[PDB]
Amino acid sequence: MNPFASLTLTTLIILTIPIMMSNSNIYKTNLYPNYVKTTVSYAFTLSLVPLLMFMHTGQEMIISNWHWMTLQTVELSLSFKMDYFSVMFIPVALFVTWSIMEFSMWYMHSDPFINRFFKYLVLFLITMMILVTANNLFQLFIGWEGVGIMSFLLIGWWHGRTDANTAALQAILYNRIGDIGFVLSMAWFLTHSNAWDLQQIFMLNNECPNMPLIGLLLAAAGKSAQFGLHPWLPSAMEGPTPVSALLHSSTMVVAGVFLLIRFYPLMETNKLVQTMTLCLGAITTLFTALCAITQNDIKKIVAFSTSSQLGLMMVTIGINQPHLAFLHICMHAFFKAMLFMCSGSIIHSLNDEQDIRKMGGLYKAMPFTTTALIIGSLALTGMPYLTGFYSKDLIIEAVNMSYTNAWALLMTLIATSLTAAYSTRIIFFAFLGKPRFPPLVLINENNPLLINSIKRLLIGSIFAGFIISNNIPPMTVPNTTMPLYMKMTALIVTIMGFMLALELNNTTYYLKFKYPSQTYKFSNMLGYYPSIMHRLPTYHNLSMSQKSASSLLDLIWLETILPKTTSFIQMKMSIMVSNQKGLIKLYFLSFLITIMISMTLFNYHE
Amino acid sequence: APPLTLEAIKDRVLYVLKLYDKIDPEKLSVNSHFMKDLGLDSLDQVEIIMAMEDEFGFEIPDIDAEKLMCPQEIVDYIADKKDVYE
Amino acid sequence: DRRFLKLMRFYILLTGIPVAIGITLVNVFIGEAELADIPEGYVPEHWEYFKHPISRWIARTFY
Amino acid sequence: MNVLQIVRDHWVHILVPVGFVFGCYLDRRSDEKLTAFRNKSLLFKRELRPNEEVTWK
Amino acid sequence: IRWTYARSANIYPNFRPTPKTSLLGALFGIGPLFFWYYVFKTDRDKKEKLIQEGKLDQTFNISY
Amino acid sequence: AYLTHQQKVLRLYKRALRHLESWCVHRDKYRYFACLMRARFDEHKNEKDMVKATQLLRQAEEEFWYGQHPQPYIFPESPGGTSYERYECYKVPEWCLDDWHPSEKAMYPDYFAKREQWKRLRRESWEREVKQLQEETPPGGPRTEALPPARKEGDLPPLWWHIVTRPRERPM
Amino acid sequence: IRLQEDPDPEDENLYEKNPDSHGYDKDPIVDLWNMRVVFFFGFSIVLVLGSTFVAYLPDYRMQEWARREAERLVKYREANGLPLMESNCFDPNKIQLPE
Amino acid sequence: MLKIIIPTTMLLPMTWMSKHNMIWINATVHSLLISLISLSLLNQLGENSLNFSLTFFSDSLSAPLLVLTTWLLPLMLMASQSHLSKETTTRKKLYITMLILLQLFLIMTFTATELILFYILFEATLVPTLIIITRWGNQTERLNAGLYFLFYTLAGSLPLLVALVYIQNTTGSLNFLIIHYWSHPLSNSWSNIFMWLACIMAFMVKMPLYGLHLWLPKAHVEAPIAGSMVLAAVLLKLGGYGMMRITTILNPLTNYMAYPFLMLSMWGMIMTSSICLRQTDLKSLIAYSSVSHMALVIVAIMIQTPWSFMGATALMIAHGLTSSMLFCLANTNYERVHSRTMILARGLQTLLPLMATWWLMASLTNLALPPSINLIGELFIITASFSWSNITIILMGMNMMITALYSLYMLITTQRGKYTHHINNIKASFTRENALMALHILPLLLLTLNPKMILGPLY
Amino acid sequence: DSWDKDVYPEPPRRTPAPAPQTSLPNPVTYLTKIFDLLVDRPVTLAREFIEQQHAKNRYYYYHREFRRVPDITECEEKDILCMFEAEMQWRRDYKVDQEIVNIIQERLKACQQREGESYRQNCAKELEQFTQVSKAFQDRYSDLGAHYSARKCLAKQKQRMLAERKAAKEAAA
């Protein structure tokens, strides 16, 4: 019973205070953003103490606080599980969002609803460390939609932008398709393993979780924006820059991957399931990167570069490498979060322009932003001894050094080469060139808020993996005897990809006209997915709803079979009964029939 | 962004027409109608407004682009589109 | 909207804070009952089978 | 203080409150007819205390 | 208001039962309902079959 | 109304160059290719056969519709651009400000006084500006959506309120 | 003129007669008093104490009494070594199954 | 028992004999007071229901609905004193008389100990609602609407009358306890199905299931605000209460005959929610959403599983509170625009910022966003249904996926987007509408802390 | 301790003695130290103040006990007077058995974090105990229906040795 368990939980109760203070409305209506930024800072500072306690000892907590309600044999209770996967994530996650908050005030220095904006970010935050810290599947399901709905409002921050609502509607849709798999896993675990706490599921050793794991995989694909369920994340750049910098870069989009890491022990028992985990990661890596190197918006480039990373993360969890995938969460949190407000720096400074074809020569104009981007891009490519090397170079070596699908392994190499490819495209068009923006120049980065925020992660990204790899206990099996030819592949492919991408990029400088290649017509159009899947299925289901369904059944048939038919029959036989002549000759004739038939025909007398 | 005011617009405006070698600097007037006196062909008029478009960073609709016809009128349509009154 | 929001923070807190101290006050005055065994020759009261004082008082006065 | 009129316009406010205290009366009257098995079920039947004569009212 | 009327009320008065309307109503009506009935029936006709002869596992399934 | 041929060619010239800019990207290429693109335009300027000019613009945009950049360059403020009605959610109609509580109205006395002048002006101007409308309306309803100015002195041009009092494009 | 009717009345704005109008009724003094009733007899006496009443309601469904019995019962059962909860409920020794 | 009934009926002389303008005040006072007394009834014992006399008793299922109905009673008075201000005092008094007379019947039926006694006021609720829909309804097709609503329920209720009296002549009394203790296995004889059909169809009709649901869109839209809430928040739920009570003597016949309704309900919810995706009328869209949620309960009750009953009672209440709120949202918007088309008044958030919030948790609650009581309902039902069959999750989850699209569809079309230029009568929201809206949402989240209160006797 | 160790068997904790060799100071010792005289002691000071106040005016409460009552297998046919006692007794035992499964479930879940990476084999005893409980619980109350009653529980049970004795007859051959 050390302070570890006590103060790992208060960190959560630290950063919920700004939410309560805002509802008072006595809260400072001017310096509110500073209030939350400092609050997250203290939440970060508190968060190290559980961390520092960890690598020394190695104790991970499960605290079962107030018992919500008990269901016969089920005891659904608010319980927080401070695993290594958790006790590490809160320190990095707040560290990133604290820097994002510092960048946020500078970037969004004119938005009149800025107090609302910072409130939303915190509300998103709370939904996050209750997702990662979730001892039971139910409160894990709490975050899985708490973050999703929070994204919808944040994405549609500019409510009037009709496309932003469409993107916001798009995000919740693709998430809910994944959410379908989530409840399927919840239903199976409760029906078979009779619980939702992760402890009972592991102990009940459901070593044949065919349907559960498929449900978990489907849940991850929607949240982590995989093939079939990716395009919401690239389309989610319509929100403001810090919004994409925090949620859809390295904090919320990675949650889907984090789900498998939580349920890794059950996944490794199965063999079939991890196939399409690395299969889906393989296709996601290539396709997102393939569309990445042809886009013309920095937000589009970076976001696709993310989805390629989450394609890469699931490749490792494919072949029994959960913690290395979690290791990749750590590094991706640093440098990927960087590239956004680094890009956001150029966007705001160069009059909110996001078309990569308008910069050039920014190397000398914004030396710090240019310096920040080159370190970030090199980290993403996986330059040795800095951030990405400690994870990606290990991962590429890891999946290569295993019994995997041959086709799956090949795409990871192509993706890594393509990973460097769009990195050159950004550095080439944006920085290495000549000015192309409007004549009046307003380039500026001297604001301390932008400088401090970027520098704060810079020192983080420079060392990064060195500290984490050296600190965490040695808890994955390290392969040792690589035939040098494939151990260099982690560096050969990116260096190779660096070469031609540079050659292809400065071929634009060559005076020769660029004829439109059909592959370019394919890659540049988001890989043709949004044009079809966002127009054909939506039209059919919508046309079914109105033409058929409502009009055909609800307003035509269902109102005619039971109600109108009886109403018609009653009216059709109300008129002929009431349509009498008034002449007794016919009435008395009817009586004579009645007397005649009743007396004899129906045997009433006998 | 400092308030872009109509005096700055015309300064930037006539900066570009004077830049246009087809309109040498000497006879630029604020209301110098292009083909009436400068002889600038209307086919190049649909070309000087994209120069304006990048100059101030926004799109000029075609409905009025063909109507954007004089440097003063160039400035006039610029001001209201960005509520420039000072 | 501002006046309306102020009305909750007035009217909800009008009974909220006196209840807030009252719940704590009974927790700093008489505390919580302990699971004592059934004494011999004395059947307990109907409301006695509860540990929290407010629950006992509610049982005493209402049910 | 105007009581000849505050009574006329606010005598309605006492109707429901007496209705509730009335409602308890039939509630605490109807149960008497339902005595029947008073301290008779072997689950709850027990030795009758020295002074009180009725276990549950 | 014309659009709302044409899409809310002015359907049945302008509706006429024809083979196109009739078949589409039947196809989108009883069709899916009976289809799901067969799917659920055979699934339940396999489930109780397994447990009846003890060919299914619910060792830890209690909260049904 | 009549989308006569010359405007269509200007439509072709303006939009194609923008697409061409999205292709060349580099300024020297854009400048170089624009001139040759310009050069191949004005060279065929002598056609008494307007039908032939139309035939020359059959394959014209078809090549463009092939040659169109799948992601053309748009300034963000324009339709399709990133900053399209981004600041719309902030702009609020002026008439809603009449609802303001008197204490709120008291917070801005002179500006509200200026509103009264605008409210006063639009009142009598409406009858004057509407009166100008019927007395000069073309027969058989309006033939063109263009609105005639204030012919006489003093009166404001008809239907001026919403255009003049339109919320500014950068409201905050 | 079809029928001698009246034109559709225009929706009056309660605010322009009295800016502090609360939308409960036209007359200001009762409108202010309706505020007091809807809040005092709304949020105040129902939501606050009602929540505390239901929250501090005595043992409902015997959720804790069964626990204490189970702890004692389970403590009895494994002490003797017999299975901690029998597969049968109504003792078959008495049961007089037909044939 | 009595401590709720006489206060409710003695409230009627108060409204009739109150001052000319104080009617809304004193009625609201004691309606909330009655709610407080009803909350005192919310307590329940372990297994034996809270029994009061031969005439009245309450269980862990009746009590949550009882406090809901009494809780509702102030809300119609709050929601109605805007479109009835310009009415003669007698008609206002008559309108209030209808509501509390309606509400009085609801306490009676939920606490009824005998099925026939449950039956007599089961249709007696129709008479006050028929008056409310017809007289004070603000539309033209309300006349045909009232006829559709009235005849549908009677067409289903009368077979129950013949069925119920048949039980009396065959199995003695129809006291709910005596039925439960003396339950016998219903045979498969071909008469017992018509026995089964009659005992079920009555609750089917006023719990709109696909096919027998066309009255609801006509019931809700043309009904006035107070009529819409009471009809959607309690009236669709007498059918629910009946099934949990009457399915005691329908087993094992329920096991085999459940199939046509289960397929009709499970497929119907996908169809009905699809209608929501393309509804032109805001009130109709909310009405059709009630069908989808209610059809989910049909599967819940008719599976006959401990978990299924529990999630039913969770959705039993949560949907009612939510649907009443959404109808308040539509009503609070309607008179300002004097139209029901959704696209008439877009971009309302920029004009009314607080209503943007109130619409927002309202949409989220209908989304079954955890931990709202709606999620506890749907999620519990899915697990019970999934245990019954593995396939149903394909239908089950698809509903949630459709439920997401149409729920935020009203949010984007109305709240977000560009404000409509032409309209200029949108005034700042009266704090009555604001207060009422919190009167709905606040207990919902307050209920999240204690699901056990509304889980039901199966809990 | 408030609860019972027999109900909740807690294996003794193996806490290694701290024997570091690196000269640079171990920080986590210091953060625990400052926490001790900044949070723990003030909390304890308030706690000892509240606990002594609680003991100043101590009020007691006991645990209700229901004596055994004839159940449904000896209750006469119909005769709802005896059925009432029978049904209530059975439902009370249903509550106890539900809590019995709950107690076992917590013990099984307690092993998981307690045994860490040794969970798979260390508490196989906990696994079989839950397996024995859950299987036996299934034979008792499972598939009784949402309208479960002691009559149905007897009915479902009466099928069990009906099949079992039929199997025993077949087994004897």
Ligand SMILES: CCCCCCCCCCCCCCCCCC(=O)O[C@@H](COC(=O)CCCCCCCCCCCCCCC)COP(=O)(O)OC[C@H](O)CO
């Ligand atoms: C709009 C149409 C109705 C809507 C749908 C309602 C539900 C559909 C079925 C309606 C059934 C109504 C009659 C049921 C009354 C109670 C039934 C009952 O208790 O079960 C009896 C079932 O017995 C019946 O015959 C009941 C009626 C069967 C259905 C035939 C009549 C009802 C249908 C036609 C009239 C209603 C339809 C509308 C007509 C305009 C048991 O008696 P038994 O036959 O077993 O008696 C012992 C022995 O065998 C001889 O009696």
